[PDB]
Amino acid sequence: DQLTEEQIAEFKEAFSLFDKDGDGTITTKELGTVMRSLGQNPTEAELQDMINEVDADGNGTIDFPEFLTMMARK
């Protein structure tokens, strides 16, 4: 079950969907854009709560290693 390049690319592609400006972090705005693509209508505060759940380093936004937590949710 060793990590594959296929999986790594899947993780990077998924991160990039959210991180649309390529700056390496997912903001509330970026997360909101993906939520709205899914027909959802979260508020800024709700988006911040979503980020808070995985924002290990407390900088208020999602980086790539934090995003992996999301990929692991069942």
Compute how many other C-beta atoms are within 10 angstroms of the C-beta atom of residue 15. 20
Judged by CB under 5 A, the chain residues 20 through 49 that form the site for Ca ion are 21, 23
The verdict on 19 binding Ca ion (CB under 5 A) reads yes
Say if CB 55 and CB 61 are below 8 A apart: yes
**Minimum CB distance to Ca ion smaller for 40 or for 59:** 59
Q: In sequence order, which residues have a C-beta less than 8 Å from that of residue 41 and are 6 or more positions away?
A: 35
The footprint of Ca ion (CB under 5 A) covers 19, 21, 23, 55, 57, 59, 63
Residues marked as binding for Ca(2+)? Answer: 19, 21, 23, 25, 30, 55, 57, 59, 61, 66
